[model samples]
Target: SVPAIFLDRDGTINVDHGYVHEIDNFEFIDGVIDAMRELKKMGFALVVVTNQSGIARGKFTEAQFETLTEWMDWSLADRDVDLDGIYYCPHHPQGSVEEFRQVCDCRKPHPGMLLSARDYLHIDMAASYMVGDKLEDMQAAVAANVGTKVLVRTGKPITPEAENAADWVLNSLADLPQAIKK
Candidate 1:
């Protein structure tokens, strides 16, 4: 099984344009591509695990989200980076839309998505890591039994809850490659 790296999308990868539903709103974080390349060289399979409650809030449609994600993948491919998988949860417990409003185990902090990815991708959970901007990302990593959890301080500011949950906190994705190397 290959070691994997779970990445968060919004604040960690792109500038958090609150509920970014369009490609125009998607802006890549500086040094993100380099960081990803470093991880690839380290033999880590890249998988994106994100929560897109924007769909539930009626900010965007799932189809739009898919189109945006496809564009993101193409953009990365242009840089010679191939993403292994992308997983997202569009549910929100108190979402404005009825269908998208509900509790879901696939959401971060639940570990469902990560665990499922581990199983499907044949990933070595103990050798894997998770990089995210939210506390729930760390919690999910812990629950999934990943080797490391890194919280990038790019999009979301560190919250009190995340302070206790994250194993490591970094200023940006640029610092992530070194953090993981160490």
Candidate 2:
């Protein structure tokens, strides 16, 4: 058996507001809950992988990130969706904060977070897929050997370079379920 979907947080699940750390900035994309519900019914184990450079930029502390995530998790749980896990990388090579400004493997494009999920959840990468809104997310899914990679044109820049890496590009998360079933 394998996990069905590995989702990206910032841009895919919530609207990306550049290093979102505050609860005030967290906005769930429309139809995302319904999509998750459909995936769950299809036996997908939903996991969130995100990059939080805000922590490195000193915009917020790790505790603050955890608090916000907890709130989001609770809110989704109330909607009858249970997220299996949430993983994030707080490192940025050029971060303003000294401690967070360093090389790390957990960041997007590195595959560390996906690998962690694989290990913890015993997922079969060959049967899994990732939905993200950035190149790094595609790269991570590719590196992690996820079966399919979907790049949602939600928060990403509508540039040629970004468009080229996507296996499938959709107008929004609302378009994901159909794309995945194909």
Candidate 3:
């Protein structure tokens, strides 16, 4: 079994560029490398669970997304940190791509991806953490029974009505390790 940190890619790991499916638009958040490096050293398996609706919108192909992901993996590997898994949900109900339009599990706000990781990796949900920038990500963590739900202030602005579903609200991933310690 593995103790993991389930992550939301856009806005958390990388700056959110709306539909970020291209290499040109993919920009990592400033503290990503340090955060990931520290997490790796802390003896946690890192996993990414992203919603790639751009593929459903036909704005890009899954192959294009994979290309970028491969680049991300290879680059991180050079720094001696490798992600244990990267799972993406490419479905959207209102999407233009007919093949990806239907509603299914595996989307954020649902625990599908986390469940899949738990099944394959034998992850201990109660010992795992889920970090992201959206309420949906927090909801998924809650649904999956993850021990901690962390929300960063880097993505969408927190609305007045948006109650904090996260166990912790961070300025960015830079402060995560400290927050985890306290």
How far is 3's C-alpha from truth in model 3 (Å)?
Answer: 1.4
| lDDT by residue (tens digit), candidate 1, 1-182 | 99998999989989997888889889999999888888888899999999999899999999999999999999988887789889999998999989999999998898988988898899999888899999999999999999988888897888989878888888987787787767
Candidate 2, residues 1-182, lDDT tens digits: the string is: 56758888877888988878889999999899888988887788888998998899898999999999999999989998898879999999998989899889999899999999999988989888888888888889989999888888777765665567667788776787787778
TM-score result, candidate 1: 0.95
Specify the poorest-scoring 10-residue window by lDDT in model 2: 157-166
Model 1 CA lDDT for position 157: 84
Give me the overall lDDT of model 1. Answer: 0.89
Candidate 3 local Cα displacement, residue 46, angstroms: 0.3
Q: Please report the candidate that would top lDDT against the real structure.
A: 1
- lDDT per residue, candidate 3, 47-91, as tens digits? 999999999999998889999999999988898878999999999
User: lDDT of candidate 3 vs native?
Assistant: 0.87
For residue 148, give model 2's deviation from the true position in Å.
Answer: 0.4
Q: CA lDDT, every prediction?
A: 0.89, 0.86, 0.87
TM-score of each model, paired residue for residue = 0.95, 0.94, 0.95
Superposed by TM-score, candidate 1 places the C-alpha of residue 107 at a distance from the truth, in angstroms, of 1.4
Model 3, residue pairs in steric clash: none
